[PDB]
Amino acid sequence: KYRVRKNVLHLTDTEKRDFVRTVLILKEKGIYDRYIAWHGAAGKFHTPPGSDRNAAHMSSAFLPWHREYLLRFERDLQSINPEVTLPYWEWETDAQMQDPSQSQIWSADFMGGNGNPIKDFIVDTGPFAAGRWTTIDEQGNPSGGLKRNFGATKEAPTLPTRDDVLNALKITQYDTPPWDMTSQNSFRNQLEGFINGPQLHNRVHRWVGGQMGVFPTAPNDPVFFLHHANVDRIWAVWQIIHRNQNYQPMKNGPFGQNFRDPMYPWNTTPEDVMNHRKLGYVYDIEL
Ligand SMILES: [Cu+2]
C-alpha cells in the first residue's frame, strides 16, 4: 500500500527523469536483459506441449504471470532508487487524442518517439534511441536498435478505447474453459484481446509495432513495462469491482495455469499474487 504506481501523464519532470535514469542503470548492470529473456522463455513454455497456451500468455496465467514479472522489475528498480515505482501508460486516454502519437509519453525526455521511416523505423529520439540502447533478437543475439511504427497496421490502426476498457470490466468470470484464446465471457481473454481481435492488450502491441509488435522481443522496448502496468491496473480494478469472483481455473486446468501451480520460469503461483496490495503497491486511482 506504500509504493504508488502513477499514471504517466501525472509524473513530474524529475520523476520521469529518475525513472529513465534507473532503467538505464538496470540495463547497464545486465539486469534488464534477464527480463527480456524470462519473457521469451515463458512464451516458449507450452501448457501442455503442443498447445498454443503458454506460461505467460494465451491462457489464464497471463494476468498473474505479468503481475509477478512487473513486481520483480519494480523491486529491481527500487534496489537502485527507493523512490522509483513503475508508472502506467493509460493508453485508453491517449486513444481520445486527435493524434495519440502526440502523447507526452513519447517525448524525448521519456520514452522517445516513433520510428524513423528512412532508417527502417529505428527510433532515433529519446533515452532509448539506437546508439544509446542496445537490443537483442529472439535468439539472444544483438539486433542493433529499438524500432517503432505507430498505427501502421491494417488490423490495429488505433489504440483501444475507454469504452473497450469499461466493457471488459463488465465481464463476471475471470476466465472460462477451455482456458485459451477462444474462451468466451472471460475477463482474461477479453483483456488479453483475442475475441474479434486484436483488441485491448493485443491491440496495443500491434499498434506500437517494432519489437513491441512481436511477443518474444517486446520487452526490448521499455514501454512494454508501462503498458503491462496498465493491464495490471485494469485487472486490479476488475478485482475490486468483482470482489466475490476469484481466479480460474482453481484446478484441472493445464499444469501451469491453475491457482496453485508454479508459473514458469518461477516458483510463484497465481495465488501468491492475487492481492496486489499484499505485494506492497497500489495504483494512484485507488487513493
Ligand atoms: Cu507478455
Side-chain angles (χ1 to χ4, degrees), residues 147 202 204-218 221:
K147 289 181 181 175
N202 290 167
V204 171
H205 280 270
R206 300 248 202 118
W207 182 90
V208 173
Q211 277 90 346
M212 276 285 288
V214 308
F215 163 102
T217 58
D221 191 337

Side-chain angles (χ1 to χ4, degrees), residues 143-205:
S143 55
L146 207 214
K147 289 181 181 175
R148 292 171 179 156
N149 192 183
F150 302 157
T153 246
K154 176 173 156 301
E155 299 70 27
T158 177
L159 290 164
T161 63
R162 295 176 64 186
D163 276 338
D164 289 339
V165 172
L166 264 36
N167 286 328
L169 287 174
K170 288 169 184 180
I171 307 296
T172 283
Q173 298 288 96
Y174 171 84
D175 209 353
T176 54
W179 326 108
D180 62 18
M181 61 177 287
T182 73
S183 291
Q184 306 295 107
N185 288 50
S186 158
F187 170 72
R188 187 277 313 163
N189 202 38
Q190 257 279 80
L191 213 198
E192 193 161 6
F194 280 111
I195 298 310
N196 295 144
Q199 302 301 161
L200 287 164
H201 156 270
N202 290 167
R203 180 179 276 264
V204 171
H205 280 270

Side-chain angles (χ1 to χ4, degrees), residues 39 54 56-57 62 65-66 69 192 201 205 215-216 218-219 224 227-228:
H39 183 255
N54 56 258
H57 56 112
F62 168 63
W65 193 97
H66 286 85
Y69 181 79
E192 193 161 6
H201 156 270
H205 280 270
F215 163 102
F224 177 88
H227 168 240
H228 274 278

Side-chain angles (χ1 to χ4, degrees), residues 63 67 165-175 185-188 191 231-248 274:
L63 294 171
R67 176 168 288 176
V165 172
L166 264 36
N167 286 328
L169 287 174
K170 288 169 184 180
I171 307 296
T172 283
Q173 298 288 96
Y174 171 84
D175 209 353
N185 288 50
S186 158
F187 170 72
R188 187 277 313 163
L191 213 198
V231 170
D232 185 65
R233 177 185 64 92
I234 298 305
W235 180 27
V237 165
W238 182 89
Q239 291 186 282
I240 286 311
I241 290 163
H242 300 276
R243 225 197 314 287
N244 279 134
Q245 289 295 331
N246 215 312
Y247 181 88
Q248 301 182 61
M274 272 302 279

